[PDB]
Amino acid sequence: ARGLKKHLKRLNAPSHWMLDKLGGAFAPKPSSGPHKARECLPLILILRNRLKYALTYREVQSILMQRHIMVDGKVRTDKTYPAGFMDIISIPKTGENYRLLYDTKGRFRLHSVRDEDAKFKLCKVRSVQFGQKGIPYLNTYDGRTIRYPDPLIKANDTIKLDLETNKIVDFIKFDVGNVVMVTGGRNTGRVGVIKNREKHKGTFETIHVEDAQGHQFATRLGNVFTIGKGTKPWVSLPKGKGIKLTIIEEQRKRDAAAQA
Amino acid sequence: GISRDSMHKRRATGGKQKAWRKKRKYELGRQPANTKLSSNKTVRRVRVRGGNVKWRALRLDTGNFSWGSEAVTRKTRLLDVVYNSSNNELVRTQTLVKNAIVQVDAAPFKQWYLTHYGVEIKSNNVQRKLEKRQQGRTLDSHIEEQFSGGRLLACISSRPGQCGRADGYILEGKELEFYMRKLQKK
Amino acid sequence: AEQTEKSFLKQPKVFLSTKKADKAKRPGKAGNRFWKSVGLGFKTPREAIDGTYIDKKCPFTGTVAIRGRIIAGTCHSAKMNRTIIVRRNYLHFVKKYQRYEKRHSNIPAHISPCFRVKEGDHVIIGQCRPLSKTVRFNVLKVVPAG
RNA sequence: UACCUGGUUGAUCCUGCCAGUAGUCAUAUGCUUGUCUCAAAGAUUAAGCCAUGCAUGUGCAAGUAUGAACCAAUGAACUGUGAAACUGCGAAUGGCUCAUUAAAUCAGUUAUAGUUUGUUUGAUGGUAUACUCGGAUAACCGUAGUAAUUCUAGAGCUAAUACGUGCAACAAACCCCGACUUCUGGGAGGGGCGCAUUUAUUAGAUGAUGAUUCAUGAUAACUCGACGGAUCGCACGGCCGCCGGCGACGCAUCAUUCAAAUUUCUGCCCUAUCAACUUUCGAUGGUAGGAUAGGGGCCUACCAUGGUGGUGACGGGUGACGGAGAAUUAGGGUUCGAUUCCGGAGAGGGAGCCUGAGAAACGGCUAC
RNA sequence: CGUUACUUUGAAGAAAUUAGAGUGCUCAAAGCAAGCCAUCGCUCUGGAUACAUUAGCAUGGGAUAACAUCAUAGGA
RNA sequence: CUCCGCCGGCACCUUAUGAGAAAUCAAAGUCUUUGGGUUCCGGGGGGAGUAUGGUCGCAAGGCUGAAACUUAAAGGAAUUGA
RNA sequence: CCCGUCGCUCCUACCGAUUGAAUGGUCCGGUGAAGUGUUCGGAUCGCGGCGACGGCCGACGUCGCGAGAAGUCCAUUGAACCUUAUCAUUUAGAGGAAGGAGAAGUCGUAACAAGGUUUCCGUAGGUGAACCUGCGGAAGGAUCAUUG
Ligand SMILES: [K+]
Ligand SMILES: [K+]
Ligand SMILES: [K+]
Ligand SMILES: [K+]
Ligand SMILES: [K+]
Ligand SMILES: [K+]
Ligand SMILES: [K+]
Ligand SMILES: [K+]
Ligand SMILES: [K+]
Ligand SMILES: [Mg+2]
Ligand SMILES: [Mg+2]
Ligand SMILES: [Mg+2]
Ligand SMILES: [Mg+2]
Ligand SMILES: [Mg+2]
Numbered sequence A: 001a002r003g004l005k006k007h008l009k010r011l012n013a014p015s016h017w018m019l020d021k022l023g024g025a026f027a028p029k030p031s032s033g034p035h036k037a038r039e040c041l042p043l044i045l046i047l048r049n050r051l052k053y054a055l056t057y058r059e060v061q062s063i064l065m066q067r068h069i070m071v072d073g074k075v076r077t078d079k080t081y082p083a084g085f086m087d088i089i090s091i092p093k094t095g096e097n098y099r100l101l102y103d104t105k106g107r108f109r110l111h112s113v114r115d116e117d118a119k120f121k122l123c124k125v126r127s128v129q130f131g132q133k134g135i136p137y138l139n140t141y142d143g144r145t146i147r148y149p150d151p152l153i154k155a156n157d158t159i160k161l162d163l164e165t166n167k168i169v170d171f172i173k174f175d176v177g178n179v180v181m182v183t184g185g186r187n188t189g190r191v192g193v194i195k196n197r198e199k200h201k202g203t204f205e206t207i208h209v210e211d212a213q214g215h216q217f218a219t220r221l222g223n224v225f226t227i228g229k230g231t232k233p234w235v236s237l238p239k240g241k242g243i244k245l246t247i248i249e250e251q252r253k254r255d256a257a258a259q260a
Numbered sequence B: 001g002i003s004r005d006s007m008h009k010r011r012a013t014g015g016k017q018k019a020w021r022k023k024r025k026y027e028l029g030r031q032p033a034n035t036k037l038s039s040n041k042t043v044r045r046v047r048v049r050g051g052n053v054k055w056r057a058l059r060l061d062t063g064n065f066s067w068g069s070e071a072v073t074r075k076t077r078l079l080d081v082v083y084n085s086s087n088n089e090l091v092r093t094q095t096l097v098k099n100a101i102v103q104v105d106a107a108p109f110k111q112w113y114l115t116h117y118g119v120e121i122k123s124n125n126v127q128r129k130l131e132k133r134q135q136g137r138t139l140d141s142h143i144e145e146q147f148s149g150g151r152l153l154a155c156i157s158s159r160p161g162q163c164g165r166a167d168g169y170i171l172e173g174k175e176l177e178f179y180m181r182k183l184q185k186k
Numbered sequence C: 001a002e003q004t005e006k007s008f009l010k011q012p013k014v015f016l017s018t019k020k021a022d023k024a025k026r027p028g029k030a031g032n033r034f035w036k037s038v039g040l041g042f043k044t045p046r047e048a049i050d051g052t053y054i055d056k057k058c059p060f061t062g063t064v065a066i067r068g069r070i071i072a073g074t075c076h077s078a079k080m081n082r083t084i085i086v087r088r089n090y091l092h093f094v095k096k097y098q099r100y101e102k103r104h105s106n107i108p109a110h111i112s113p114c115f116r117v118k119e120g121d122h123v124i125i126g127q128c129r130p131l132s133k134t135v136r137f138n139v140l141k142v143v144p145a146g
Numbered sequence D: 001u002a003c004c005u006g007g008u009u010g011a012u013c014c015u016g017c018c019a020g021u022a023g024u025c026a027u028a029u030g031c032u033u034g035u036c037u038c039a040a041a042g043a044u045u046a047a048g049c050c051a052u053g054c055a056u057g058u059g060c061a062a063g064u065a066u067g068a069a070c071c072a073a074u075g076a077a078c079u080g081u082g083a084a085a086c087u088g089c090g091a092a093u094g095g096c097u098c099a100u101u102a103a104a105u106c107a108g109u110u111a112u113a114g115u116u117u118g119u120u121u122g123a124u125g126g127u128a129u130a131c132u133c134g135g136a137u138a139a140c141c142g143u144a145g146u147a148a149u150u151c152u153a154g155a156g157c158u159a160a161u162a163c164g165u166g167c168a169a170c171a172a173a174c175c176c177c178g179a180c181u182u183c184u185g186g187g188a189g190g191g192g193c194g195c196a197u198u199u200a201u202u203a204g205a206u207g208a209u210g211a212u213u214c215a216u217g218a219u220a221a222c223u224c225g226a227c228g229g230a231u232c233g234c235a236c237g238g239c240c241g242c243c244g245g246c247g248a249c250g251c252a253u254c255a256u257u258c259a260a261a262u263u264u265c266u267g268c269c270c271u272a273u274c275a276a277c278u279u280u281c282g283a284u285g286g287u288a289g290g291a292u293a294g295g296g297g298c299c300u301a302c303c304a305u306g307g308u309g310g311u312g313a314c315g316g317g318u319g320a321c322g323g324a325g326a327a328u329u330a331g332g333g334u335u336c337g338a339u340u341c342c343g344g345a346g347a348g349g350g351a352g353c354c355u356g357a358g359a360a361a362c363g364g365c366u367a368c
Numbered sequence E: 001c002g003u004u005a006c007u008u009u010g011a012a013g014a015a016a017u018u019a020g021a022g023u024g025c026u027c028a029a030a031g032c033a034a035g036c037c038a039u040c041g042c043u044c045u046g047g048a049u050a051c052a053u054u055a056g057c058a059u060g061g062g063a064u065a066a067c068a069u070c071a072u073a074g075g076a
Numbered sequence F: 001c002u003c004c005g006c007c008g009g010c011a012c013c014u015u016a017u018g019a020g021a022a023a024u025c026a027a028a029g030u031c032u033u034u035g036g037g038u039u040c041c042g043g044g045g046g047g048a049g050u051a052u053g054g055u056c057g058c059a060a061g062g063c064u065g066a067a068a069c070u071u072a073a074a075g076g077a078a079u080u081g082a
Numbered sequence G: 001c002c003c004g005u006c007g008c009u010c011c012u013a014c015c016g017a018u019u020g021a022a023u024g025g026u027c028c029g030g031u032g033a034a035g036u037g038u039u040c041g042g043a044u045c046g047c048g049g050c051g052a053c054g055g056c057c058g059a060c061g062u063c064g065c066g067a068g069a070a071g072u073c074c075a076u077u078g079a080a081c082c083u084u085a086u087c088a089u090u091u092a093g094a095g096g097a098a099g100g101a102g103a104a105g106u107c108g109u110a111a112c113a114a115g116g117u118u119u120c121c122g123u124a125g126g127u128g129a130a131c132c133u134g135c136g137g138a139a140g141g142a143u144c145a146u147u148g
């Protein structure tokens, strides 16, 4: 190619979007923004496929051009805006607030949150280093730069950001024993506590996580997001509570529900 | 045009590589600046990838030169090109390239040395600071003997064809001895 | 002794003509020879720290960084200036016959003067930036045949 | 469904092939063809040649209206709605094809501590007539030329977020020189000092990485710097003329995102009736440069004699784009993979470019 | 402060295709829908999972096997 | 010379519990209950060990070695008859 | 049952001079469009300047700065053209000489029985043809057998 791609073929769209195969030749190509294209949930999908507010592309445009949707406290009119993990989606007309979390099957789920709980997001620190003028600055995986961060904050940390004031109100150090959520790979959406961190020089670092029921899983450092200090996450979790179920137990639940 | 691709080369085994694509613009080369030492300063704007700017010096006569032991940097005129390590053609053509050895005017450095040390190579405060600096003052007598002629041996550390400037450092110590031996063997 | 070229050969960003010379400072400071640990658990040879050679492609005293693959092998040829051929021997599985066949790969690697190598020695190379047309590796450890 | 049957003999048992028997998201063709759903479709030969038509244009409250434009109003700069045109952006995506191409593309797996990146998101921005500068030009208008083309000349007007200039709200700190002072110092005054660029010296200990003379600071200078707002909409209030909100557009830096480029390892069909190949004129490596966005014989100068090869180099063939995959399959396997997804490449064949963040672009230009 | 093969487990190995869970498009090939006594709504509705040579990364194992050594041990 | 053993060699006789299409074979056995190691080498019959290329040889020739085309058998062991 | 030569109808392949042609690719020399960079160049256009003249405008002489077209120089990329030879093709070809199939004539009877000289292998020579002969070898022999 002689430049950037503008189109996303529907077959080549992320599989967690759960787009259907015959809905068209194309999928919404996510715009550049805070989250990666392959790891985000675009606004058009949230509005039409998930919340059912809109029925068409044009209806999503109509809703967004009314300035009805705020992402993390700010009005977005781009339909392909890449909304991502832990983002607050608020509609200050119906009075509903949503935190974009992962279910245990790797798919973004709009989790309803309280009005007070929609006043902060959780960000993962990507790096800490000196900017111009020798001023220390923090950057996250959701594209934010924060200057003069707390010196106790290091890379891979989780900071609590107040959307109203745009400051770090609290932070969590990436340590063994902190409850985490996996945001990438086959364990996406799984919640557990870190048991040990296995480091290997020159290559990716492996984190060993054990969930509440005792199942153990391992994932790379880049796919781990701390959500609480200790065994108590700072945000509310979806109904699964991050506890992945085997297909046999899912069938048990379905059989019990049908029997009732 | 000039390209930088590995397409046209032979393989490491010696076998010829058949072309599978025309030349791309993202692998181009441009013709050398061939910066000459001349008092007709010409630096041209080269528009490069990303909409960025490269400065292409064609003729230069003045440079920014650093005397590292003294930690002083002065703008001096370029007088001559004397040694090139890659091609004496560049010496006879007076071509300014990075790592070329040149003659630079010593007058700014003489002036700074007189002002700073009080030594040519009116207050109690000024005389006190001058005596403090003069204590431990040590020149190397090679820089001194070229100061006698007013020409300092210098090495162009900047790339004139890229930045449009002919900057460098004054030669000192073992490098100075090496290049004096080379110039006397020339 | 090391000035065997038509140009003086200096370590970049090391001021040799410094007046306030000192040996208790870190490498590259006060005219000290610059050297670095390559990382990845590889010790810096003492002949690189105490050497007088100037090699910009040296992993320990040059400007190259070791990043990417770490490959073991045997010195197959050492007839080039600071460059050797590393032969890697491996078994290629043939699916249909459920057997293996012996296959080899000739990897050119730059070798710094801190190592002396002979054909047959066991060497450890690390991936670096392209140093020439065929070289993308630097010798990091040499184990003699005996 | 892990399957066989006829055919050599006068008869027999074999070896062995011929023939039959089934499939093909496999093509063509023949005959026939009522209904429903589903659906390939000028790839194979000619990446052969193309009449005609269409396939890329674009306007918000928010750059620029005085249409001799329309509706509505009726002493006022500009009502509103606005064609045209300038300005801005896009046209580098998509679509099509498979000719070239056999460790090459490509696949998985690395790397950039070897780079560029319009845009998005986040953060950042201080030492350079002002109650606001200048000259043009389009549309318009009217003199034309030519057989002719979004071929073209001259004249008269007038805009800017076009173009070009220019105060750039003010400051501390820091560095250098330094009259005087009574003095290991004090110190007026003068110069430098935004951001970016280039070089050099220095700090970075015992902030960061597996690892950097790293991030970053300081200092000396340097550059004839396309930087540091002479822009627009809505609302228009608070203090006595001064302050004042919500936006839009634009400049620069870093980060992020969208990506590319290059790059590590391993992996490809047939052929030895292809066993040597590469190296004048780059072949393999080294030094110093040049060039490039950046590494690199990518190129140049000098130097050395290397580099690959029966573990098949080099060469040749392919009716060879690679892969995901497809057909058939007890298992193992055999054959196919032009075609809708990913990657690559090309736009009659070569070559060369301009613009642009991004093209060696072809529904862009230049030449053969 | 001997490697490697081998084996085990883990992370990856796009989607679509394949295998396969659910679901009465009237069936089916399909599709990724849908279902609920009828509900100004609800089921957080669902939109699983498996496979994926070789090569690469990591974990445990050392039987089998390969390579390197293997009486100046001149050992500590 | 005689007798009894052991190892090694050229062979022979009998026998099937074996194998084989059988002839026959004590290996030609230990094979659909299929795997000790390794080299060469065959894929219906002709064309054909021919053409051509290469290589060796003084030559004669040797080594390597096709295709087009053609054909439904050719061939092996054994039985009965003539 | 059968083998071969010679006749005659067709098919396939081979050799083959004519230094056989046609097609394209490489090699060697050149020529070389066009672009890009560079050197001069300076049509022209602006801004100002010194003083002056004439009635802010306008003309001329005067002198600086800036922009800059055509053209031009060298370099570079380099299409394309010509030349030598080579390679890969396509490829006529007088004539020669095979093989196969089909009719099927002719001369014999070489292989099958000890096939009427047992057969065959290697090599050499000869002959209308199957073949014959010499030397060595084999039984796939017509002998598993003479301690007689
Ligand atoms: K590309
Ligand atoms: K554009
Ligand atoms: K790859
Ligand atoms: K480079
Ligand atoms: K080099
Ligand atoms: K653009
Ligand atoms: K015996
Ligand atoms: K006879
Ligand atoms: K006989
Ligand atoms: Mg079978
Ligand atoms: Mg495209
Ligand atoms: Mg630094
Ligand atoms: Mg270099
Ligand atoms: Mg092809």
Ligand SMILES: [Mg+2]
Residues within 6 Å of the ligand: D337
């Ligand atoms: Mg394909």
Ligand SMILES: [Mg+2]
Residues within 6 Å of the ligand: none
């Ligand atoms: Mg084809």
Ligand SMILES: [Mg+2]
Residues within 6 Å of the ligand: D339
């Ligand atoms: Mg098609």
Ligand SMILES: [Mg+2]
Residues within 6 Å of the ligand: none
């Ligand atoms: Mg494609």
Ligand SMILES: [Mg+2]
Residues within 6 Å of the ligand: none
């Ligand atoms: Mg193209």
Ligand SMILES: [Mg+2]
Residues within 6 Å of the ligand: D348
């Ligand atoms: Mg065509």
Ligand SMILES: [Mg+2]
Residues within 6 Å of the ligand: D362
């Ligand atoms: Mg083109």
Ligand SMILES: [Mg+2]
Residues within 6 Å of the ligand: D363
């Ligand atoms: Mg077209």
Ligand SMILES: [Mg+2]
Residues within 6 Å of the ligand: none
């Ligand atoms: Mg196009």
Ligand SMILES: [Mg+2]
Residues within 6 Å of the ligand: F034
């Ligand atoms: Mg067997």
Ligand SMILES: [Mg+2]
Residues within 6 Å of the ligand: none
């Ligand atoms: Mg045969």
Ligand SMILES: [Mg+2]
Residues within 6 Å of the ligand: G109, G110, G115
């Ligand atoms: Mg007879």
Ligand SMILES: [Mg+2]
Residues within 6 Å of the ligand: G117
């Ligand atoms: Mg006879």
